[PDB]
Amino acid sequence: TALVCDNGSGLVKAGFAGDDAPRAVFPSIVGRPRHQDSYVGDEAQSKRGILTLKYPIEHGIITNWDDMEKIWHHTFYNELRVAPEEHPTLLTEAPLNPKANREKMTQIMFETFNVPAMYVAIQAVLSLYASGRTTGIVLDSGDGVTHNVPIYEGYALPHAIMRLDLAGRDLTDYLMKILTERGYSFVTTAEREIVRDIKEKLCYVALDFENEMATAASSSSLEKSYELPDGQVITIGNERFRCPETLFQPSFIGMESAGIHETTYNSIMKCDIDIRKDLYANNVMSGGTTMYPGIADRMQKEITALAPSTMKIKIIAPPERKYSVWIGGSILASLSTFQQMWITKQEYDEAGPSIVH
Amino acid sequence: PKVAENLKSQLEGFDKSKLKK
Numbered sequence: 526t527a528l529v530c531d532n533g534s535g536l537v538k539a540g541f542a543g544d545d546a547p548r549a550v551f552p553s554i555v556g557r558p559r560h561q562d563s564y565v566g567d568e569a570q571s572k573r574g575i576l577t578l579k580y581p582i583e584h585g586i587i588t589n590w591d592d593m594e595k596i597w598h599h600t601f602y603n604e605l606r607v608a609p610e611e612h613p614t615l616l617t618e619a620p621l622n623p624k625a626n627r628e629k630m631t632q633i634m635f636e637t638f639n640v641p642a643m644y645v646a647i648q649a650v651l652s653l654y655a656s657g658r659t660t661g662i663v664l665d666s667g668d669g670v671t672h673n674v675p676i677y678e679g680y681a682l683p684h685a686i687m688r689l690d691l692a693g694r695d696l697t698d699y700l701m702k703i704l705t706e707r708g709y710s711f712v713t714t715a716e717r718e719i720v721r722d723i724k725e726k727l728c729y730v731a732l733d734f735e736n737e738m739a740t741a742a743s744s745s746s747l748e749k750s751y752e753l754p755d756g757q758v759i760t761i762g763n764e765r766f767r768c769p770e771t772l773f774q775p776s777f778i779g780m781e782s783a784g785i786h787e788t789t790y791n792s793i794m795k796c797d798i799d800i801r802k803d804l805y806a807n808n809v810m811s812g813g814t815t816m817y818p819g820i821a822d823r824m825q826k827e828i829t830a831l832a833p834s835t836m837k838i839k840i841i842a843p844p845e846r847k848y849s850v851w852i853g854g855s856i857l858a859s860l861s862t863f864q865q866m867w868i869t870k871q872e873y874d875e876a877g878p879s880i881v882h
Numbered sequence: 883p884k885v886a887e888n889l890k891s892q893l894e895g896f897d898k899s900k901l902k903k
C-alpha cells in the first residue's frame with residue numbers, strides 16, 4: 526500500500542492512499558527530557574512540563590533533521606502502525622522549498638526507513654488536484670505560513686508564488702492579546718488552547734469591515750458567549766472579526782505585508798497574461814486558517830474590485846478544505862497513471878538524492 | 883510529453899465518492 530504524509534508546521538495529517546480522510550492527525554513537535562527519552566505529537570503536548578518542546582517544521586520549511594526524523598519515525602510506528610519498508614510514501618513540501626531541503630527528504634526516506642519508493646509534491650498543487658482542477662491559483666493558509674500558489678496544467682509557477690509569513694498561529698496570539706487587553710489573563714502555552722478554541726468556534730471574516738464595526742457598536746446582535754473551564758463568561762463582540770481581518774490588513778500585528786487579497790492579485794499578475802482568466806475563475810482555498818466563515822465572500826469582493834470589471838471571478842472554498850492537501854495526495858498516489866512516477870529505490874541507488882529534481 | 887495528459891485526465895475526472903471511509 527501507498528502512504529500519504531503531509532508535514533506542516535502545525536499538523537502532521539497522515540493515513541493511506543485511496544482513503545477520503547487521514548487516520549493520524551497530530552501536532553508537529555518533538556519533545557525531549559529537559560534534564561537528567563523522547564515523545565512526539567499529543568503525547569509530547571500532554572507532558573510539556575518535563576520535556577523540551579520543538580517545532581521542527583516552523584513556517585513550512587524543515588529546519589532540523591533529527592527532530593523531523595523522529596517525527597517520521599512516529600508517523601510510521603505509533604500513529605499509523607506500519608512497517609515503512611513496504612509502502613510507497615508520498616511526502617508533501619512547502620512552496621519555494623530549497624533544493625537542499627528537497628534532496629534531504631529523499632536521502633532520508635530511502636536511507637533511514639528504506640521505503641520501496643517515494644514521491645514529493647507541493648501542497649498547493651495537492652489542494653488543486655483535490656478540487657478537480659489542474660489550473661488556477663490556490664490560497665494555502667496553515668498554522669505558521671501562508672501562500673499564494675499559481676498553477677497551470679498541473680504545475681506550480683515558482684517565479685509567481687507569494688508568501689505571507691502570518692497564519693493561524695499569528696491570529697491566535699493577536700486574539701489572546703486582545704482579550705488580555707480587556708482584563709483577561711492568557712499567558713502559558715497551555716491556556717493558548719482555550720483561545721484557539723475561541724478562535725475556531727467563534728471568529729469570522731467581515732464582508733465589509735467598517736459596516737461591521739458600525740453594526741457591533743449599534744447592536745448586541747454580534748455578541749457571543751463562551752464558558753471557560755474555570756467558570757467565567759467572556760462576552761466577545763467585535764473581536765470575532767477583528768482577529769481574522771489581519772489576513773487582509775496584517776499591520777494589526779505590525780507587519781508590512783499586503784493582505785491575502787493583494788498577494789492574490791500580484792501572484793496572478795506575475796503570470797502569463799493569457800492564463801490569467803483561468804486563475805481568476807479557479808481560485809481555490811485550503812488549510813484550517815481558511816476555515817473562517819465569510820472568507821471566500823470577502824475574497825470575491827476584494828478581487829472583483831482589483832480585477833477588470835467584467836472578469837468572471839469564482840472563489841472555491843470546498844467544505845473539507847482543511848484536509849485537501851492530504852486528500853489530493855491520497856487521490857494522486859493511487860491513480861493508475863501515477864504509479865510509474867514514483868522514485869524507486871534502484872533509481873535512487875543509481876542516481877542519488879538529486880534525482881528528486 | 884505523454885505522462886501528463888493521462889494523469890491530467892484521471893485527476894480532473896476523478897470522483898471522490900470513490901475514496902474509502
Ligand SMILES: Nc1ncnc2c1ncn2[C@@H]1O[C@H](COP(=O)(O)OP(=O)(O)OP(=O)(O)O)[C@@H](O)[C@H]1O
Pocket residue numbers: 532533534535536537582583584585666667668669670692693694697721724725726811812813814815816817847
Ligand atoms: N475551524 C477552524 N477555523 C479557523 N481556524 C482553524 C480551524 N481549525 C484549525 N484552524 C487553524 O489552522 C491551523 C492548522 O491548519 P493546517 O492543518 O492547515 O496547518 P498546517 O499545514 O500545520 O500549517 P503549516 O503548513 O504551517 O504546517 C491552526 O493554527 C488552527 O488554529
Ligand SMILES: [Mg+2]
Pocket residue numbers: 533648667812850
Ligand atoms: Mg499545510
